[PDB]
Structure 1
């Protein structure tokens, strides 16, 4: 389905895609291979959908946080640069694109948000979030505003949520989610108060913040290096500086490494490797991209040493040091989807902060909590003995849901025994190969009919039935993969329903005696 003897590249519409296209033409001049650069909308959502059918671009550019999901789903080629090429880029940039001990992409550039301020309106930018309300009252008296930034993407609000102790995954313990802790609450409450007190507008997006800053209407924005080009063109006298503190603590931006992955379905992997290693990741390659839209602190040592004298890059790295490198684990997609919704709902008043972050903590934890319950149930059903290990400090839900599933699922296996035996005989489950096939079937069976807990119990009960069979034919090793597939089916297709029901607390409530 992907065309051979050509390279299609996807990169986000805020990056230097014209610069990338020049590196494309320089690859074409020397090889006669034509490089097409596209910047589709929602490309981080559209990559997994199309790559999963063997389609999409040869090369996908995004921050590293989305690459573990892609690698887990088999969408990316392992990359195997020799040691002489590895030594040309900073090791911590390689760490960002290492997943299960394999390099799954090429690192390009280190991205961190900074505070961007109009030196003509605000010769001394605030050191603290707390002084922005008073500052805004002062600028409003002159027909200006203190601060506008994109409230539609959680990335821009995360530094403030994280300042007083909010976090995604404790360092990575995916059992420890920091989305609804007191630190997160205090950060998002301060944001909502800025909106309530009319210092910010809940509808402000990328375009509105950018235009307001570049036209000199607002004294400050929050943005990455890519934004500096449009500000150069604007003639705004701007500075790039350390983010304001919150409760005396630094803002901690989530740090992204812009990364180039190679489609597993691509029949041009050697051309892609040749383009990325010998044309893009060179002094002339990165300069071409950088001149269009700044990359930040580039992964390439030679060229990073030239750019590091720029005070805007120094400020970028200063914000990077105070932030955290994002996790690349497959949970990150769901974490971002949850926190985006929480910030938008808290900002608009659809939900309170406590409500919004409660829903976001449930969404971020949903996968791991589902798998915990389902894997424990399938294993104990297969072996006749429960798992002895602790459920966690935050897993009282997990223990109650498993108790409910045991009580309710007891009957479902017994009543549907004849029908389960038939369906199992109608499939040929014999090894890990056959378990792959089940997902399509379960999806299709879960794709029609009504969404309720009874049907979820029926699905998991068939899972346990299969786990028992797997154990009988010495395929015990296939139980965890089966449990992952049932979890994947359940979470990927019913996420929004499950968050609505308060996830597994809902399940325990619905069948309470």
Structure 2
């Protein structure tokens, strides 16, 4: 492969303690004579799947657990199998965070949650509510200070407020149940936008700007995670870490992340990586080395957390964590975060109204599951000649899109039968490994669009054609992964177009009779 044998390359995000991680690398190198190299590439969570998909990249990838399901689904991660004894050294719920389809796909490192960080000298008694921050800002502005600055370019930081009065991603209690554009999410975002309209915050504020303003004592509060504490320590600001403000009497609910370490599927150094992570990093001295660089939060290792738990900053971190929720690791978490990122930025800048912004994010977030429901049902009923008698769920969009697809797809399949026959024969889709090869082909072709619903119908119709063939040669098991592959290709390459058409509602209206 392209990844070098007998070395370790490790990627971790630039806001984490990568210099501390390098020391742990240095110790490994001392013992074994094996080179360890730590990098913190920009846009890491985007860069890794790009390079790993070609069998390249780092041996070890660090990120919060939410992205790892997508990585694993794309075949980019090796299954990890720690022995029972190592497993028992970490909290079971941190292992739960890195389980995907019944398999462990990463080592959990530390539990991260946002807290309210405040300047004790400016604000001895920080607000318990979001609602009182406008008035507090006015009071502080008279002194040449502002109340609150935090990163508005990443939805992670705004999510706690969105979730406060009822917003949610995928319902936890149902991936078909998405609460990005309900009244609670709209109330939360609207409050944020009003703060901006009323000059209490600035839409342009990002991570660097907010951090600088807090650490220079210009703003009384910021919202951030444990990794940020080291820089505040250096600035000598007298800070406290506390519970996030409530909104409409309800706690802010941060999405909780577990910093995790995955092993590249393409790495020839999986045994080396295992050794490094289990017996160097995930020890008291290993985690201390990283934690002393940038604080990890509440670590997964039971022994070392027993000490860190005494830190009131950690207690505050876990208080906020318990009021929030552990992130899902389903493959469309990335699409969810992109949708909401755009919604927050657009609402904050005035490019969209809050309502229209969150509507788009709802559609974006639901896009994979909605598309899969339609495409899977269509391919299956086409292959077997009979519909699925199971209930749709939410909602009328699926039923109407499927009705439309059946009606339009009938003519498309009749007219394209000869073409489909030739393409099926040209390719050789005979099993599930052939389905993967088709995806790579489709990704290349479908970026040359030029998108309309007719082309999408032709693609799905070819899918149905192939599905029929797979049933005929007794490979009915291949139909669902075919549907997933086409769905993945479609929603990935035509995401923006699909959201612009209002998703499958646009499909139904376009072909309305």
Aligned residue number for residue 288 of structure 1: 289
1:92 aligns with 2:93: yes
Paired residue secondary structure (1:135): helix
Q: Deviations over 1:164-202 (max 9, x none)?
A: 111111128110111111111110010001001110000
Give the Å deviation of 1:77. 0.9
Give the Å deviation of 1:509. 1.1
Q: Deviations over 1:221-263 (max 9, x none)?
A: 0000000000011010000000000011000010001001000
Paired residue secondary structure (1:173): coil
| Aligned-partner Cα distance in 1 for 2:86–2:205 | 43
Give the Å deviation of 1:120. 0.4
Paired residue secondary structure (1:9): strand
Aligned residue number for residue 504 of structure 2: 504
Q: After the TM superposition, which of the residue ranges 118-127 and 432-441 deviates more from structure 2? A: 432-441
Q: Deviations over 1:75-104 (max 9, x none)?
A: 111111111111111111111111111111
Q: Deviations over 1:113-135 (max 9, x none)?
A: 00000000000000000000000
| Aligned-partner Cα distance in 2 for 1:80–1:418 | 49
Q: After the TM superposition, which of the residue ranges 432-441 and 378-387 deviates more from structure 2? A: 432-441
Give the Å deviation of 1:450. 2.5
29 and 331 in structure 1: CA distance in 2 versus 1, 3 angstrom threshold? same
Q: CA RMSD in A?
A: 0.9
| Aligned-partner Cα distance in 1 for 2:204–2:351 | 13
Q: Deviations over 1:346-390 (max 9, x none)?
A: 000000111001000000000011111111111111111111111
Give the Å deviation of 1:449. 4.7
Q: After the TM superposition, which of the residue ranges 442-451 and 153-162 deviates more from structure 2? A: 442-451
1:229 aligns with 2:224: no
Paired residue secondary structure (2:93): helix
| Aligned-partner Cα distance in 2 for 1:314–1:135 | 26
Aligned residue number for residue 70 of structure 1: 71
| Aligned-partner Cα distance in 2 for 1:58–1:36 | 10
| Aligned-partner Cα distance in 2 for 1:64–1:133 | 35
Q: Deviations over 1:331-358 (max 9, x none)?
A: 1111000000000000000001110010
Aligned residue number for residue 399 of structure 1: 399
| Aligned-partner Cα distance in 2 for 1:335–1:314 | 29
| Aligned-partner Cα distance in 2 for 1:427–1:172 | 44
| Aligned-partner Cα distance in 2 for 1:239–1:143 | 21
428 and 254 in structure 1: CA distance in 2 versus 1, 3 angstrom threshold? same
Q: After the TM superposition, which of the residue ranges 425-434 and 146-155 deviates more from structure 2? A: 425-434
| Aligned-partner Cα distance in 2 for 1:78–1:116 | 37
Q: After the TM superposition, which of the residue ranges 426-435 and 319-328 deviates more from structure 2? A: 426-435
| Aligned-partner Cα distance in 1 for 2:104–2:173 | 18
Give the Å deviation of 1:510. 1.1
Paired residue secondary structure (2:109): strand
Q: After the TM superposition, which of the residue ranges 87-96 and 436-445 deviates more from structure 2? A: 436-445
Q: Deviations over 1:3-45 (max 9, x none)?
A: 0111100000000000000001000010001111000000011
Q: After the TM superposition, which of the residue ranges 118-127 and 449-458 deviates more from structure 2? A: 449-458
Give the Å deviation of 1:428. 2.0
Q: Deviations over 1:124-172 (max 9, x none)?
A: 0000000000000000011100000000000000000001111111128
Q: Deviations over 1:427-485 (max 9, x none)?
A: 22222122222212333332335211111111111111111111111211111111111
Q: How many residues were matched structurally?
A: 512
Paired residue secondary structure (1:122): coil
Paired residue secondary structure (2:260): strand
| Aligned-partner Cα distance in 2 for 1:459–1:243 | 48
| Aligned-partner Cα distance in 1 for 2:93–2:9 | 28
Q: After the TM superposition, which of the residue ranges 240-249 and 483-492 deviates more from structure 2? A: 483-492
172 and 57 in structure 1: CA distance in 2 versus 1, 3 angstrom threshold? farther
Paired residue secondary structure (1:36): strand
| Structure 1 residue ranges without an equivalent (≥5) | none
| Aligned-partner Cα distance in 1 for 2:116–2:159 | 14
Q: After the TM superposition, which of the residue ranges 101-110 and 425-434 deviates more from structure 2? A: 425-434
| Aligned-partner Cα distance in 2 for 1:449–1:42 | 26
| Aligned-partner Cα distance in 1 for 2:13–2:130 | 30
| Aligned-partner Cα distance in 2 for 1:476–1:218 | 61
Aligned residue number for residue 252 of structure 2: 251
Q: After the TM superposition, which of the residue ranges 441-450 and 282-291 deviates more from structure 2? A: 441-450
49 and 264 in structure 1: CA distance in 2 versus 1, 3 angstrom threshold? same
| Structure 2 residue ranges without an equivalent (≥5) | none
Give the Å deviation of 1:404. 0.8
TM-score, normalised to structure 2's length?
A: 0.99
Aligned residue number for residue 158 of structure 2: 157
| Aligned-partner Cα distance in 2 for 1:502–1:171 | 25
Q: Deviations over 1:267-290 (max 9, x none)?
A: 011111001001111111011101
Paired residue secondary structure (2:50): helix
449 and 179 in structure 1: CA distance in 2 versus 1, 3 angstrom threshold? closer
TM-score, normalised to structure 1's length?
A: 0.99
| Aligned-partner Cα distance in 1 for 2:417–2:80 | 47
Aligned residue number for residue 190 of structure 2: 189
| Aligned-partner Cα distance in 1 for 2:411–2:323 | 54
| Aligned-partner Cα distance in 2 for 1:318–1:443 | 44
